[PDB]
Each structure stands twice: as C-alpha cells, then as structure tokens.
Amino acid sequence: SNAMKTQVAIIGAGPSGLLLGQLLHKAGIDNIIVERQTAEYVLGRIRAGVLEQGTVDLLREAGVAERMDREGLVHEGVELLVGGRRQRLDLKALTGGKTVMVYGQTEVTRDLMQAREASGAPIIYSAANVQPHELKGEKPYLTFEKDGRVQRIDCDYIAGCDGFHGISRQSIPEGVLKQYERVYPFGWLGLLSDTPPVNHELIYAHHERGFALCSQRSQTRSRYYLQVPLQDRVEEWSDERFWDELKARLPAEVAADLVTGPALEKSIAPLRSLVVEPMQYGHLFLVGDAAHIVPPTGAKGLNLAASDVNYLYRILVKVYHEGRVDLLAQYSPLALRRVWKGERFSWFMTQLLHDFGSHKDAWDQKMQEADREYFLTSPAGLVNIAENYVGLPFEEVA
C-alpha cells in the first residue's frame, strides 16, 4: 500500500514514546508510534514507581495526571537503613519543599495509552522488524511488517524510544557512538504483592547479607527487592525464600510487622550503568533506555527518560513553531548533561548500599562504610542525597 505520512516517527510505546507523542500531539506536531509488542504485553511490565517532580510536571502538561494525582501518593521522605538503624531523609525539609510521587510506571503507561486512544493519534502495535532509513537524508522513514505486509512511514524526524534492546541505537553506523559502561556483579530480585506496605515510605536497606528495598505502588500494593548474584534465576527463588531473606535483611521490629503474600509478579533485573555519546545521529534521536541505563538504586531510570523527552519535546516545538531546525543539535548536549548527573548519583547510591563481596578490595569496603557514616550523619551529606533523590532541575532551552 501507500506510505503513511507524519512529522515525528516514534519507535517504542513505552513511557518515553507515549509521553513524547502525547506532548507533541497536544502541541500540534503529528506523530506515529510503532511498538514491537502487544498493548497487553507492554502493560504487563512491572518496573519503576518513583516519579520526580519534573516527570510529574511533564505528565500534568501532557494532560494525563488526573489519575496520578488521585491514586498516586506524594512521599515527603525516604529511609536509609545501615547497621540496623533507621535514618529518615525528610526530602521536603532538606530540599525546602520538594517531594517525590509514588505511582506505578504501569499506571503511567496505562494513562498515556488511554489518553492517546482518546486523541486518535495513530499508534501501531505488534509491528515486526521496525527499521529506520535515510537518517542523514532529508526524508527519513520507517519500514515494518504487520498482517503479512511491509508498511512504510515517511517523517521528518525519528525518536528512538525503543529501550535497552531497541533497534534505534543499533541502526547508527560504527564509530559514531561511544559507550561508557559499568556492569555490577548483582541484580535485583523483585516481588510485587497484593499486601500492605511495611512502611508508608521507601526503606533502602544495607545489610551484611546484602541490599534490600521495601517499596510499594499503593496502599494495597507492595514491591520488595533483594540484591542477588548474577547467576541466580527466578526459578531458584520461591515466594517463601524471598520473604525469609527479606526478613533476614531487616531489623526484627520491621520483620514482625511485614505482611507477606503471593507474588503477582516476580523477576530479576541485572544492574548496569550505561551511557552512549552522542544520543543522536542525523534525524534520529535516542531517548530513555535506548540511550542510557542506570541501576535503580537512585530511582532515576524513568526520570531520565522523562528529561530526555523534555528536551527533545521543547526543541521540536521550536523547530516547527519557530522554524529552528538546527536547534536539534543541542539535544544530546542538554540530555547528556542531566544524564551524567543522574548516572553519577545512581552509581553513588549503588556503591553505598550494596554488598560487592570479593568484587571490591578491603580499601573500597572501608570507604563504603565511611561514606555510610558521613552521608547519614552530616547534615550536608543528607542534603547531598536528598537534593539528588528528588531530581536535579531541567535546564531551559535557548
């Protein structure tokens, strides 16, 4: 058949692709989203839960915040647990007013999907072998297969919002991108349960046996994590083994108040820090997990995706409304400045709260311990953590 036509072709219907598309459509910039999996499959992913104010603001601007505001929970603080002691970080007081919002990525994604349904902005699911073409040409395009037919999308710009295993990043020629990576010797084993959270705020716990995070998605939906060796598989961890181990890494007081229950979802995510430079090539712009990855210890993943969306969205508005086509050259510079800040903090928190075993020498272990002392005791240290946790500012586009 004949080629579909739009202004911005978006690869990936995850939070990045959907939010970008929603913001663009509201601003009168035509876009089409193509996604490899089914709508159901995308919604089945249990991932992030902590939204920085910048992300919340973007969602409000996109006009998809009614449910987030009603069913989400503003968290004014977080706890770091070292040596069995519970240290609360009053993010609100430490930052002079900032907070975080606990609302599931799945929920955010569902809201964005319902909003796109209402607008009628085209979105195509179960699209196989999406390939971008003529990234340097003036007329880039996408091809894909669906319903046993090759389909084409002509556009001006391509936004690669296709995640860690996307096609976007891989479509850029060799030499162009440079990669910076740190692979951690552990993953997070996550368990979502239909049970009351043990605390009204997140508890990041460092314990001799290893790291543990007590989290949640609502007043009736809990999310717990344990660091685990890379070899470990989710089949080796029954619901009971996970509950017992979580209990062993928490103080007796918290262990007793913990209400356990069957896992609605359980899986292991390997931890890695990854960044590519630049985050664009010609008319293709990499957004979110397609460009960078962080360990979730700082709750920065989805929030960095959102800042990437922020910058590309505000540049594109000026490209089409003010004809400033060349402003797109500042996308990577802007995005990367904030990516490195979040990457730094995510790296810092991972080093601070995890058991590295033989992967760190004796000196580095002592420095981990002295950092745990200093950062949770010094008022300036607590302020260092709090201001990073709530999310550093977005810079203005010139």
Add this chain to the structure above:
Amino acid sequence: NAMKTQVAIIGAGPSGLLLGQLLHKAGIDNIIVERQTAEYVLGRIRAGVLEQGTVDLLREAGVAERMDREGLVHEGVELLVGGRRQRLDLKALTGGKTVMVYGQTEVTRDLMQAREASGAPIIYSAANVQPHELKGEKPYLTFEKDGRVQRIDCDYIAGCDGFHGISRQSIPEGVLKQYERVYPFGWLGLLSDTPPVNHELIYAHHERGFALCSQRSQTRSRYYLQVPLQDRVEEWSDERFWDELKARLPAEVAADLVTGPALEKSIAPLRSLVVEPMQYGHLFLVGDAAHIVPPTGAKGLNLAASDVNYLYRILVKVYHEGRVDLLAQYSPLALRRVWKGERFSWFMTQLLHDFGSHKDAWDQKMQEADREYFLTSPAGLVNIAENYVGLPFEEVA
C-alpha cells in the same frame, strides 16, 4: 642505672613532641627518644596547613606564641577545574572555622625549643630503640648511644615514630590489620623564596595532572605536581618544574607566577593507610606510625594531633582519676576520626588527580561528574569545606 618515667615516647617529630609537651604540663613525666639528630628532624619540609583543633592544642601546650605571630589565617581555599575557579569561603560555609598556614618545620622547631626550656628529657641519636614487655605492668625501652646500652622503665609507651618506626613492628604477628590504597603517583614539591601566586591555596585539576599552589609564608611558596611513581627528583630540573606547573594552570594564572630557584625539592609517594587497632597492651600508636593519608586533604599532621589529643586526655584521667578503663578507648576514639580524615583525603585525591590507565573509562567519567557536582552544588561545597577545616574532637569523658 635505668632511667625511670611514666610515659616513654618513641619519636621526636610533631606527634612525640606535642604529646610530651602536653603530658609534661599536666605533671605526667615522659622521656622522648629519637633515632635522628635534632638538626636532621628540623631539616624536614612537610605540612603547612593546621586545623583549629591542632591550633587549639598547641595553644593548650603553651607553644603557640611564634605561630600566633608568624602563622597566617586562611578564610578560604580555591579548587580549580577546567579554567573555572571555585573559591570555598571556609568561614562562611562552616560557621566561622578557618585554617592556619604555618610550616610543620616551624611547629617542630617551636616544640623543640619549649622542651629544651622545660628540661623534660629528650635523647637524640638513640639507635636500635626497642620496646619490651608490652602487656606487662613494667614495659620498657632499650637503645644504644655513646657505645652503651641504656634502658627506660615506664608505665606506657607512645609509638610516635612515623611510617618507618619500630613500634608498629614490635606488636605480635597478626594483631594488627593493615588497610591500604597505594596511588599510582607521588607529589613533586618545590619550596621557593618567591611570592605565592595567590594568597590562598589553589588545588588545580588539569588534563595533564594535579597541581597545588601553596605556601609557607608571604615570602615563601610551596608548589606541588603529581608525578608517576617511576620519576626521580633528579629528572626534574627547576626549569622543567616551573614550565609544567604553568602548563597545569589557566594561562591567566600562569602569566603572573613568579618563579625562582628551589630551596627544597623532593618527591613524596601518595598512600592511604590505616592500621587497626592502634594499640597493644601498654603500647599506643600515634600519628604516622598508625596511619598515612595522601596530603590532598591536608589531614596528616592534623590526624596526628587528634591521636595525641585522645591519648593525652586519656592519660590525664588515668593518672589523676584512676580511669584505667579509658585506655581501651584510645583506638576506638582515634580510629573514628582517622577514618573520617582518610575518607576525605581519598575523596579529594580521587576528585583532583589524573589516574592515567589506573582507572577505567567509567571511573574517569564519575571523577568528571564528581567535579561538576561537588563544585557547583551549595551542599557539595559545604561538604568539602566542613571536611577541610577538620571535624570536631569528641570528648573523652
């Protein structure tokens, strides 16, 4: 016959002299034994920056007159990254705390003159000093001088004998545990009779490597350059030193730098080293005998001073209040502050030096990000400033 005292002190460097001066004043007898001659000890060119805790201690010891007259109070320090100058107003950021620039040699000289005036015994050129009966109730030292073996009977031994001392090596095998990080570089220092390029210290990170613009007075400058461990001082002419220093500074700063012939020039290797515990029986390790820091945080002499402070306050209570229980608190107290200083010294070293290929691309990227974060965040600067002026001494109660 044998010499008798309460506390026998090994080493006549800053640790040993300050501990001896404080103890003597409190009425606690002490003898100091030193391997080198007095002249040789004075020939050493090292520290220059004193925390208020160290300044307070010297005033308490009654050896502050010359420091209060010739030392210079610094209200800030500068950190320099990619041309940017970030002044840390220590006073404004820490609620009034400052640092004192006064040479370690000057402090050492003043202490030596005060002990001479008091007549508290001190023995130079004490060879093969050895401690014995560390856990017994009657510990003692032996040493050789003027062709004869001499003995000092005491109640406690203070090992203030530095990195190459005998005290640490005298403790039975396996008791001590050594934590260490050896840096792939040293500091080439040059003392010059020229005006400092700035009235405050300048810690400069540069693609080519770290440089420190420091001073001993308004007429005497002290500059440092990081150099690889292979380097020998004989490979560094004054000319090469000056040119390299200028290459590591913004052109606008280098332009007015006044160069001159070296009065002293040597390379010190950098290392982070902590020994635990810091005592065995009636033997206590003090200062460099127990721990080393890279000088990037100006913590060395200052940690030695806090070790001295704790051992001194404990001994006062031991002798005047029979608080023998408190001797077990020396290592816990000293190590709490030592680890904090070690952390800071490590932090500053990581932040400001070039590690070449001793650091992978990811760690270089985290250095770059740390320099961006700590030097632009108000909280980041507070963090550095409060560590730089030195964290408080805890009370020995």
